[PDB]
Amino acid sequence: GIVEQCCTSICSLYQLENYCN
Amino acid sequence: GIVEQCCTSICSLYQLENYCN
Amino acid sequence: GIVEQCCTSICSLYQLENYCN
Amino acid sequence: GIVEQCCTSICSLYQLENYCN
Amino acid sequence: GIVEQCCTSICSLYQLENYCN
Amino acid sequence: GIVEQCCTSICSLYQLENYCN
Amino acid sequence: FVNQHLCGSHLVEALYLVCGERGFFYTPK
Amino acid sequence: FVNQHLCGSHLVEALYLVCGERGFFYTPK
Amino acid sequence: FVNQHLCGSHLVEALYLVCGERGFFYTPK
Amino acid sequence: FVNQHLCGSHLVEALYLVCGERGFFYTPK
Amino acid sequence: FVNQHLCGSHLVEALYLVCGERGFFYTPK
Amino acid sequence: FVNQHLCGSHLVEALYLVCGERGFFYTPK
Ligand SMILES: *C(=O)CCCCCCCCCCCCC
Ligand SMILES: *C(=O)CCCCCCCCCCCCC
Ligand SMILES: *C(=O)CCCCCCCCCCCCC
Ligand SMILES: [Cl-]
Ligand SMILES: [Cl-]
Ligand SMILES: [Zn+2]
Ligand SMILES: [Zn+2]
């Protein structure tokens, strides 16, 4: 999930965008 | 400036990029 | 929605809980 | 104090409430 | 109070210091 | 730079002020 | 509407804290 | 894990900004 | 009053930074 | 201890939300 | 003007995230 | 380094408060 992906490594805005509706 | 542009309307991420260095 | 409910009046913590999953 | 309690372990909102007036 | 003083005008850092303990 | 100085040690507001225009 | 955008930034911060492990959903107007 | 709690707070703020009008679910678990 | 609530969120952040180890007191209207 | 400084910033925001009209003192030491 | 001050606080947070390693410049009105 | 990313977010908020009308550049690298 988002915490395992983006709290272990910096997620760019493009990677974060995957979690949007 | 950014205040006049982005406090009077919502700036998109690409509009905000104009204030990056 | 939450914006119409909680940006026009202050929502209590229990009102905010209606937007939890 | 609040830093020793709640920066060493996650404090829930109910635990934080102890620090209110 | 701080709300009446610093939400109706911008308080300087030294004005904010009046609300430190 | 500011990250090496102020993410390795707490910078006070007076130290941060060095980075202002 | 910028003021709505600023309100929503605070609403999601509050939902994060209120909702805990349940998470939350945010949909703007 | 407090650092995990702190990271999640910043995650949700970033999703708010990226997703815009789309909205998002925050599903930590 | 939501705008007062948003102002106060920024005021406590500022007091935290200004006041340092002294801490601060926050009382809304 | 920077991580302590960062944690305190989030603490004060959470107290602001939980305490509401009650207000609070933030007394780190 | 307090509302401008609150808007700018959110603008610098957004620039930090958008601009990445480039950093950004912020100048108020 | 996520903790570095999180620290920078708080740095920029603190510069916003300290610098006031002066503005600032944020130059991480
Ligand atoms: C879409 O962009 C806007 C739809 C919702 C707008 C809300 C308007 C609410 C009242 C705010 C008034 C602010 C100052 C007069
Ligand atoms: C209690 O709920 C409210 C008491 C203090 C209210 C402050 C009103 C200040 C001016 C804000 C006007 C905003 C838009 C016209
Ligand atoms: C300097 O202190 C102010 C210069 C810029 C001011 C912006 C005014 C913009 C419109 C806000 C109206 C808010 C409520 C009626
Ligand atoms: Cl953090
Ligand atoms: Cl705001
Ligand atoms: Zn705000
Ligand atoms: Zn943080």
mmCIF file of C-alpha atoms and ligand atoms in Angstrom:
data_model
loop_
_atom_site.group_PDB
_atom_site.id
_atom_site.type_symbol
_atom_site.label_atom_id
_atom_site.label_comp_id
_atom_site.label_asym_id
_atom_site.label_seq_id
_atom_site.Cartn_x
_atom_site.Cartn_y
_atom_site.Cartn_z
ATOM 1 C CA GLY A 1 0.000 0.000 0.000
ATOM 2 C CA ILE A 2 0.911 3.693 -0.072
ATOM 3 C CA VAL A 3 2.691 3.618 3.315
ATOM 4 C CA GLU A 4 4.933 0.675 2.428
ATOM 5 C CA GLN A 5 5.748 2.193 -0.988
ATOM 6 C CA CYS A 6 6.110 5.868 -0.084
ATOM 7 C CA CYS A 7 7.360 5.840 3.478
ATOM 8 C CA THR A 8 10.249 3.466 2.596
ATOM 9 C CA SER A 9 11.293 5.513 -0.486
ATOM 10 C CA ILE A 10 10.411 9.046 -1.663
ATOM 11 C CA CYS A 11 7.460 8.966 -4.021
ATOM 12 C CA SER A 12 7.343 11.647 -6.656
ATOM 13 C CA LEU A 13 4.078 13.381 -7.495
ATOM 14 C CA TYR A 14 3.812 11.030 -10.489
ATOM 15 C CA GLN A 15 4.031 7.958 -8.250
ATOM 16 C CA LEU A 16 1.537 9.469 -5.781
ATOM 17 C CA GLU A 17 -0.864 10.054 -8.688
ATOM 18 C CA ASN A 18 -1.390 6.285 -8.895
ATOM 19 C CA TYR A 19 -3.352 6.520 -5.620
ATOM 20 C CA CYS A 20 -5.846 9.115 -6.903
ATOM 21 C CA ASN A 21 -9.412 8.295 -7.909
ATOM 22 C CA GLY B 1 3.633 37.185 -8.616
ATOM 23 C CA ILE B 2 2.585 33.805 -7.240
ATOM 24 C CA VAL B 3 0.290 35.402 -4.666
ATOM 25 C CA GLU B 4 -1.640 37.385 -7.260
ATOM 26 C CA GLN B 5 -1.781 34.399 -9.614
ATOM 27 C CA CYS B 6 -2.419 31.528 -7.213
ATOM 28 C CA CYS B 7 -4.294 33.096 -4.315
ATOM 29 C CA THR B 8 -7.005 34.503 -6.590
ATOM 30 C CA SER B 9 -7.512 31.186 -8.504
ATOM 31 C CA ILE B 10 -6.318 27.633 -7.919
ATOM 32 C CA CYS B 11 -3.055 27.056 -9.776
ATOM 33 C CA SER B 12 -2.436 23.709 -11.368
ATOM 34 C CA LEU B 13 0.752 21.803 -10.655
ATOM 35 C CA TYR B 14 2.095 22.938 -13.951
ATOM 36 C CA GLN B 15 1.315 26.594 -13.139
ATOM 37 C CA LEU B 16 3.095 26.185 -9.797
ATOM 38 C CA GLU B 17 6.165 24.881 -11.638
ATOM 39 C CA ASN B 18 6.729 28.430 -12.971
ATOM 40 C CA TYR B 19 7.996 29.330 -9.478
ATOM 41 C CA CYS B 20 10.558 26.551 -9.305
ATOM 42 C CA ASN B 21 14.132 27.459 -9.882
ATOM 43 C CA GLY C 1 -20.137 16.279 0.802
ATOM 44 C CA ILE C 2 -17.480 17.042 3.404
ATOM 45 C CA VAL C 3 -16.678 20.398 1.813
ATOM 46 C CA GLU C 4 -20.272 21.601 1.959
ATOM 47 C CA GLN C 5 -20.707 20.250 5.489
ATOM 48 C CA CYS C 6 -17.375 21.122 7.087
ATOM 49 C CA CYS C 7 -16.198 24.211 5.231
ATOM 50 C CA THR C 8 -19.401 26.122 6.003
ATOM 51 C CA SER C 9 -19.381 25.196 9.753
ATOM 52 C CA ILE C 10 -16.798 23.599 12.028
ATOM 53 C CA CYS C 11 -17.323 19.838 12.119
ATOM 54 C CA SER C 12 -16.774 18.004 15.352
ATOM 55 C CA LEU C 13 -14.501 14.983 15.486
ATOM 56 C CA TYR C 14 -17.521 12.786 15.456
ATOM 57 C CA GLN C 15 -18.911 14.542 12.355
ATOM 58 C CA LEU C 16 -15.544 14.074 10.636
ATOM 59 C CA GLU C 17 -15.721 10.345 11.395
ATOM 60 C CA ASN C 18 -18.536 10.071 8.808
ATOM 61 C CA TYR C 19 -15.834 10.392 6.123
ATOM 62 C CA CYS C 20 -13.694 7.562 7.436
ATOM 63 C CA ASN C 21 -13.859 4.295 5.639
ATOM 64 C CA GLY D 1 5.426 15.112 29.356
ATOM 65 C CA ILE D 2 3.656 15.017 25.990
ATOM 66 C CA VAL D 3 6.887 14.634 23.974
ATOM 67 C CA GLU D 4 8.165 11.671 25.989
ATOM 68 C CA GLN D 5 4.732 9.986 25.883
ATOM 69 C CA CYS D 6 3.659 10.744 22.316
ATOM 70 C CA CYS D 7 6.894 10.916 20.378
ATOM 71 C CA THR D 8 8.024 7.484 21.684
ATOM 72 C CA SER D 9 4.644 5.823 20.914
ATOM 73 C CA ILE D 10 1.650 6.915 18.795
ATOM 74 C CA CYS D 11 -0.906 8.707 20.924
ATOM 75 C CA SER D 12 -4.498 8.393 19.856
ATOM 76 C CA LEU D 13 -6.804 11.402 19.947
ATOM 77 C CA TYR D 14 -8.124 10.059 23.266
ATOM 78 C CA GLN D 15 -4.634 10.054 24.790
ATOM 79 C CA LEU D 16 -3.918 13.534 23.386
ATOM 80 C CA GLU D 17 -7.151 14.761 24.997
ATOM 81 C CA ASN D 18 -5.488 14.388 28.406
ATOM 82 C CA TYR D 19 -3.330 17.422 27.529
ATOM 83 C CA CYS D 20 -6.278 19.744 26.815
ATOM 84 C CA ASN D 21 -7.467 22.439 29.207
ATOM 85 C CA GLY E 1 -6.734 37.011 22.742
ATOM 86 C CA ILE E 2 -4.393 35.715 20.047
ATOM 87 C CA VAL E 3 -7.270 35.091 17.644
ATOM 88 C CA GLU E 4 -8.557 38.652 17.877
ATOM 89 C CA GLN E 5 -5.033 40.068 17.660
ATOM 90 C CA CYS E 6 -3.433 37.813 15.057
ATOM 91 C CA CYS E 7 -6.308 36.696 12.853
ATOM 92 C CA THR E 8 -7.359 40.278 12.093
ATOM 93 C CA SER E 9 -3.772 41.449 11.264
ATOM 94 C CA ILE E 10 -0.499 39.616 10.696
ATOM 95 C CA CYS E 11 1.407 39.354 13.971
ATOM 96 C CA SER E 12 5.151 39.670 13.927
ATOM 97 C CA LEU E 13 7.320 37.037 15.561
ATOM 98 C CA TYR E 14 7.771 39.315 18.488
ATOM 99 C CA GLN E 15 3.993 39.794 18.844
ATOM 100 C CA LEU E 16 3.550 36.012 18.749
ATOM 101 C CA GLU E 17 6.067 35.687 21.590
ATOM 102 C CA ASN E 18 3.452 37.231 23.928
ATOM 103 C CA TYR E 19 1.655 33.858 23.827
ATOM 104 C CA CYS E 20 4.673 31.819 24.851
ATOM 105 C CA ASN E 21 4.839 30.637 28.387
ATOM 106 C CA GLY F 1 23.090 24.096 2.396
ATOM 107 C CA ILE F 2 19.967 24.444 4.540
ATOM 108 C CA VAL F 3 19.204 20.693 4.549
ATOM 109 C CA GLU F 4 22.683 19.667 5.697
ATOM 110 C CA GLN F 5 22.715 22.395 8.378
ATOM 111 C CA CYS F 6 19.136 22.212 9.647
ATOM 112 C CA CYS F 7 18.152 18.600 9.161
ATOM 113 C CA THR F 8 21.254 17.351 11.052
ATOM 114 C CA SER F 9 20.737 19.793 13.976
ATOM 115 C CA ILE F 10 17.764 21.952 15.046
ATOM 116 C CA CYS F 11 18.040 25.421 13.575
ATOM 117 C CA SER F 12 16.532 28.221 15.581
ATOM 118 C CA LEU F 13 14.547 30.963 13.873
ATOM 119 C CA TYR F 14 17.700 33.106 14.057
ATOM 120 C CA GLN F 15 19.727 30.501 12.158
ATOM 121 C CA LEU F 16 16.922 30.050 9.604
ATOM 122 C CA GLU F 17 16.913 33.826 9.065
ATOM 123 C CA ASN F 18 20.291 33.497 7.331
ATOM 124 C CA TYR F 19 18.469 31.839 4.405
ATOM 125 C CA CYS F 20 16.032 34.726 3.840
ATOM 126 C CA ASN F 21 16.358 37.238 1.014
ATOM 127 C CA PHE G 1 -12.066 28.741 -5.359
ATOM 128 C CA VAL G 2 -8.920 29.137 -3.302
ATOM 129 C CA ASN G 3 -10.618 29.321 0.088
ATOM 130 C CA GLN G 4 -12.221 25.952 -0.521
ATOM 131 C CA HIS G 5 -8.838 24.577 -1.495
ATOM 132 C CA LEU G 6 -7.347 25.811 1.816
ATOM 133 C CA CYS G 7 -10.236 24.404 3.828
ATOM 134 C CA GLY G 8 -9.872 20.995 2.179
ATOM 135 C CA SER G 9 -6.118 20.859 3.028
ATOM 136 C CA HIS G 10 -7.055 21.102 6.714
ATOM 137 C CA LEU G 11 -9.956 18.636 6.352
ATOM 138 C CA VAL G 12 -7.705 15.865 4.996
ATOM 139 C CA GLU G 13 -5.210 16.463 7.831
ATOM 140 C CA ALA G 14 -8.089 16.101 10.290
ATOM 141 C CA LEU G 15 -9.483 12.966 8.643
ATOM 142 C CA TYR G 16 -6.025 11.376 8.736
ATOM 143 C CA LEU G 17 -5.907 11.840 12.484
ATOM 144 C CA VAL G 18 -9.536 11.042 13.224
ATOM 145 C CA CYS G 19 -9.790 7.941 11.028
ATOM 146 C CA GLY G 20 -6.631 6.108 12.041
ATOM 147 C CA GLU G 21 -6.077 2.714 10.444
ATOM 148 C CA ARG G 22 -9.489 2.907 8.699
ATOM 149 C CA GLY G 23 -8.231 5.655 6.401
ATOM 150 C CA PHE G 24 -10.700 7.940 4.755
ATOM 151 C CA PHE G 25 -12.061 9.171 1.490
ATOM 152 C CA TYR G 26 -11.793 12.688 0.233
ATOM 153 C CA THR G 27 -13.803 13.974 -2.702
ATOM 154 C CA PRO G 28 -13.933 17.735 -3.384
ATOM 155 C CA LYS G 29 -17.063 19.446 -4.614
ATOM 156 C CA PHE H 1 5.685 3.553 14.973
ATOM 157 C CA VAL H 2 5.567 7.364 15.343
ATOM 158 C CA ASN H 3 7.761 8.062 12.273
ATOM 159 C CA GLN H 4 5.219 6.069 10.256
ATOM 160 C CA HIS H 5 2.410 8.256 11.680
ATOM 161 C CA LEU H 6 4.331 11.391 10.750
ATOM 162 C CA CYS H 7 5.058 10.149 7.238
ATOM 163 C CA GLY H 8 1.354 9.382 6.636
ATOM 164 C CA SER H 9 0.374 12.948 7.535
ATOM 165 C CA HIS H 10 2.633 14.251 4.738
ATOM 166 C CA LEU H 11 1.444 11.552 2.349
ATOM 167 C CA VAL H 12 -2.188 12.683 2.660
ATOM 168 C CA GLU H 13 -1.237 16.340 2.078
ATOM 169 C CA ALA H 14 0.660 15.346 -1.069
ATOM 170 C CA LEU H 15 -2.269 13.254 -2.378
ATOM 171 C CA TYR H 16 -4.587 16.217 -1.728
ATOM 172 C CA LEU H 17 -2.368 18.366 -3.947
ATOM 173 C CA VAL H 18 -1.717 15.818 -6.725
ATOM 174 C CA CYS H 19 -5.241 14.434 -7.042
ATOM 175 C CA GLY H 20 -7.029 17.780 -7.149
ATOM 176 C CA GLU H 21 -10.619 17.540 -8.262
ATOM 177 C CA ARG H 22 -10.268 13.746 -8.592
ATOM 178 C CA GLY H 23 -10.273 13.067 -4.868
ATOM 179 C CA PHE H 24 -8.628 9.991 -3.387
ATOM 180 C CA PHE H 25 -8.998 7.231 -0.863
ATOM 181 C CA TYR H 26 -6.319 6.953 1.780
ATOM 182 C CA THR H 27 -6.061 3.251 2.625
ATOM 183 C CA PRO H 28 -3.114 2.613 4.929
ATOM 184 C CA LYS H 29 -4.146 -1.020 5.597
ATOM 185 C CA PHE I 1 -16.510 29.982 12.092
ATOM 186 C CA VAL I 2 -14.325 27.967 9.758
ATOM 187 C CA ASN I 3 -11.986 30.792 8.779
ATOM 188 C CA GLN I 4 -11.098 31.330 12.414
ATOM 189 C CA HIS I 5 -10.454 27.622 12.751
ATOM 190 C CA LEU I 6 -8.025 27.742 9.784
ATOM 191 C CA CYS I 7 -6.265 30.813 11.140
ATOM 192 C CA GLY I 8 -5.787 29.176 14.542
ATOM 193 C CA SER I 9 -4.193 26.056 12.942
ATOM 194 C CA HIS I 10 -1.474 28.313 11.515
ATOM 195 C CA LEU I 11 -1.132 30.304 14.762
ATOM 196 C CA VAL I 12 -0.329 27.195 16.830
ATOM 197 C CA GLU I 13 2.253 26.098 14.232
ATOM 198 C CA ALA I 14 3.846 29.539 14.527
ATOM 199 C CA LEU I 15 3.799 29.554 18.332
ATOM 200 C CA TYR I 16 5.455 26.126 18.369
ATOM 201 C CA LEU I 17 8.342 27.493 16.351
ATOM 202 C CA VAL I 18 8.573 30.893 18.007
ATOM 203 C CA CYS I 19 8.304 29.679 21.607
ATOM 204 C CA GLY I 20 10.781 26.811 21.562
ATOM 205 C CA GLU I 21 11.335 25.024 24.861
ATOM 206 C CA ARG I 22 9.046 27.515 26.670
ATOM 207 C CA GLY I 23 5.998 26.093 24.907
ATOM 208 C CA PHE I 24 2.915 28.196 24.596
ATOM 209 C CA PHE I 25 -0.722 28.480 25.447
ATOM 210 C CA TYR I 26 -3.522 28.497 22.961
ATOM 211 C CA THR I 27 -7.055 29.504 23.862
ATOM 212 C CA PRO I 28 -9.593 30.142 21.072
ATOM 213 C CA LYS I 29 -12.181 32.879 21.299
ATOM 214 C CA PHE J 1 17.223 16.196 18.007
ATOM 215 C CA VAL J 2 15.533 17.221 14.725
ATOM 216 C CA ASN J 3 13.111 14.245 14.658
ATOM 217 C CA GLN J 4 11.916 15.399 18.084
ATOM 218 C CA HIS J 5 11.349 18.920 16.675
ATOM 219 C CA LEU J 6 9.378 17.479 13.772
ATOM 220 C CA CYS J 7 7.274 15.271 16.031
ATOM 221 C CA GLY J 8 6.362 18.252 18.258
ATOM 222 C CA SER J 9 5.047 20.203 15.267
ATOM 223 C CA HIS J 10 2.554 17.393 14.556
ATOM 224 C CA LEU J 11 1.712 17.038 18.241
ATOM 225 C CA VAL J 12 0.590 20.678 18.477
ATOM 226 C CA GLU J 13 -1.575 20.352 15.342
ATOM 227 C CA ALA J 14 -3.249 17.269 16.820
ATOM 228 C CA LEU J 15 -3.892 19.015 20.168
ATOM 229 C CA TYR J 16 -5.393 21.965 18.265
ATOM 230 C CA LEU J 17 -7.855 19.577 16.621
ATOM 231 C CA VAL J 18 -8.694 17.441 19.682
ATOM 232 C CA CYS J 19 -9.012 20.236 22.236
ATOM 233 C CA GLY J 20 -11.221 22.505 20.144
ATOM 234 C CA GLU J 21 -12.804 25.302 22.110
ATOM 235 C CA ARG J 22 -11.039 24.083 25.275
ATOM 236 C CA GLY J 23 -7.607 25.319 24.262
ATOM 237 C CA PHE J 24 -4.431 23.741 25.598
ATOM 238 C CA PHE J 25 -0.995 24.439 26.954
ATOM 239 C CA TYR J 26 1.921 22.924 25.099
ATOM 240 C CA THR J 27 4.591 22.242 27.725
ATOM 241 C CA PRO J 28 7.472 20.286 26.216
ATOM 242 C CA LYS J 29 9.678 20.722 29.323
ATOM 243 C CA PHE K 1 -3.684 40.689 5.261
ATOM 244 C CA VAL K 2 -4.095 37.434 7.139
ATOM 245 C CA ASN K 3 -5.855 35.533 4.364
ATOM 246 C CA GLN K 4 -2.930 36.176 2.055
ATOM 247 C CA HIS K 5 -0.593 34.954 4.762
ATOM 248 C CA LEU K 6 -2.579 31.685 5.046
ATOM 249 C CA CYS K 7 -2.659 31.218 1.284
ATOM 250 C CA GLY K 8 1.106 31.700 1.030
ATOM 251 C CA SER K 9 1.745 29.026 3.726
ATOM 252 C CA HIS K 10 -0.009 26.498 1.477
ATOM 253 C CA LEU K 11 1.724 27.792 -1.677
ATOM 254 C CA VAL K 12 5.218 27.186 -0.260
ATOM 255 C CA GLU K 13 4.200 23.663 0.823
ATOM 256 C CA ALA K 14 3.013 23.034 -2.735
ATOM 257 C CA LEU K 15 6.144 24.480 -4.343
ATOM 258 C CA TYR K 16 8.309 22.288 -2.107
ATOM 259 C CA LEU K 17 6.564 19.208 -3.428
ATOM 260 C CA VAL K 18 6.227 20.306 -7.038
ATOM 261 C CA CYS K 19 9.775 21.625 -7.459
ATOM 262 C CA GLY K 20 11.763 18.774 -5.948
ATOM 263 C CA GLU K 21 15.538 19.118 -6.062
ATOM 264 C CA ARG K 22 15.245 22.372 -8.075
ATOM 265 C CA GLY K 23 13.856 24.195 -5.048
ATOM 266 C CA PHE K 24 11.836 27.308 -5.553
ATOM 267 C CA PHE K 25 11.598 30.977 -4.841
ATOM 268 C CA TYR K 26 8.920 32.606 -2.791
ATOM 269 C CA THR K 27 8.371 36.348 -2.738
ATOM 270 C CA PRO K 28 5.178 37.754 -1.171
ATOM 271 C CA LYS K 29 3.384 40.746 -2.610
ATOM 272 C CA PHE L 1 15.719 9.444 2.059
ATOM 273 C CA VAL L 2 12.104 9.980 3.207
ATOM 274 C CA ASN L 3 13.057 11.540 6.581
ATOM 275 C CA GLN L 4 15.034 14.121 4.600
ATOM 276 C CA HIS L 5 11.923 14.840 2.476
ATOM 277 C CA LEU L 6 9.835 15.263 5.614
ATOM 278 C CA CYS L 7 12.386 17.550 7.248
ATOM 279 C CA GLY L 8 12.488 19.808 4.156
ATOM 280 C CA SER L 9 8.716 20.300 4.276
ATOM 281 C CA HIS L 10 9.036 21.723 7.811
ATOM 282 C CA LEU L 11 12.084 23.769 6.846
ATOM 283 C CA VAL L 12 10.152 25.622 4.126
ATOM 284 C CA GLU L 13 7.253 26.364 6.506
ATOM 285 C CA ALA L 14 9.703 27.793 9.044
ATOM 286 C CA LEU L 15 11.431 29.966 6.405
ATOM 287 C CA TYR L 16 8.002 31.233 5.301
ATOM 288 C CA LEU L 17 7.338 32.371 8.869
ATOM 289 C CA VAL L 18 10.792 33.819 9.648
ATOM 290 C CA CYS L 19 11.391 35.621 6.357
ATOM 291 C CA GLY L 20 8.003 37.321 6.155
ATOM 292 C CA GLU L 21 7.837 40.053 3.567
ATOM 293 C CA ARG L 22 11.473 39.367 2.602
ATOM 294 C CA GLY L 23 10.746 36.136 0.768
ATOM 295 C CA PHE L 24 13.362 33.424 0.369
ATOM 296 C CA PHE L 25 14.875 30.950 -2.023
ATOM 297 C CA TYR L 26 14.761 27.312 -1.028
ATOM 298 C CA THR L 27 17.871 25.717 -2.536
ATOM 299 C CA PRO L 28 18.264 22.147 -1.309
ATOM 300 C CA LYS L 29 21.092 21.380 -3.783
HETATM 301 C C1 LIG M 1 -16.405 25.619 -7.289
HETATM 302 O O1 LIG M 1 -15.343 26.057 -7.788
HETATM 303 C C2 LIG M 1 -17.084 26.393 -6.183
HETATM 304 C C3 LIG M 1 -18.283 25.638 -5.609
HETATM 305 C C4 LIG M 1 -18.389 25.805 -4.092
HETATM 306 C C5 LIG M 1 -18.126 27.261 -3.745
HETATM 307 C C6 LIG M 1 -18.396 27.649 -2.283
HETATM 308 C C7 LIG M 1 -18.771 29.123 -2.019
HETATM 309 C C8 LIG M 1 -19.022 29.197 -0.495
HETATM 310 C C9 LIG M 1 -18.989 30.538 0.270
HETATM 311 C C10 LIG M 1 -17.605 31.188 0.290
HETATM 312 C C11 LIG M 1 -17.662 32.716 0.261
HETATM 313 C C12 LIG M 1 -16.274 33.342 0.417
HETATM 314 C C13 LIG M 1 -16.137 34.874 0.371
HETATM 315 C C14 LIG M 1 -17.375 35.747 0.083
HETATM 316 C C1 LIG M 2 -17.442 32.565 17.068
HETATM 317 O O1 LIG M 2 -17.849 31.509 16.533
HETATM 318 C C2 LIG M 2 -17.075 33.747 16.200
HETATM 319 C C3 LIG M 2 -16.472 34.891 17.016
HETATM 320 C C4 LIG M 2 -15.326 35.579 16.272
HETATM 321 C C5 LIG M 2 -15.735 35.767 14.820
HETATM 322 C C6 LIG M 2 -14.785 36.630 13.975
HETATM 323 C C7 LIG M 2 -15.411 37.370 12.773
HETATM 324 C C8 LIG M 2 -14.242 38.173 12.155
HETATM 325 C C9 LIG M 2 -14.296 38.701 10.705
HETATM 326 C C10 LIG M 2 -14.313 37.586 9.658
HETATM 327 C C11 LIG M 2 -15.139 37.941 8.421
HETATM 328 C C12 LIG M 2 -15.030 36.868 7.336
HETATM 329 C C13 LIG M 2 -15.830 37.042 6.032
HETATM 330 C C14 LIG M 2 -16.791 38.237 5.875
HETATM 331 C C1 LIG M 3 -1.106 43.896 1.340
HETATM 332 O O1 LIG M 3 -1.092 43.851 2.592
HETATM 333 C C2 LIG M 3 -2.355 43.486 0.594
HETATM 334 C C3 LIG M 3 -2.139 43.474 -0.919
HETATM 335 C C4 LIG M 3 -2.860 42.302 -1.589
HETATM 336 C C5 LIG M 3 -4.249 42.178 -0.982
HETATM 337 C C6 LIG M 3 -5.186 41.182 -1.682
HETATM 338 C C7 LIG M 3 -6.700 41.459 -1.562
HETATM 339 C C8 LIG M 3 -7.371 40.337 -2.389
HETATM 340 C C9 LIG M 3 -8.855 39.960 -2.193
HETATM 341 C C10 LIG M 3 -9.149 39.361 -0.817
HETATM 342 C C11 LIG M 3 -10.537 39.728 -0.290
HETATM 343 C C12 LIG M 3 -10.857 39.010 1.023
HETATM 344 C C13 LIG M 3 -12.200 39.291 1.720
HETATM 345 C C14 LIG M 3 -13.158 40.350 1.139
HETATM 346 CL CL CL M 4 7.674 14.639 9.931
HETATM 347 CL CL CL M 5 -5.836 28.278 5.594
HETATM 348 ZN ZN ZN M 6 -4.395 26.674 5.987
HETATM 349 ZN ZN ZN M 7 6.353 16.332 9.398
#
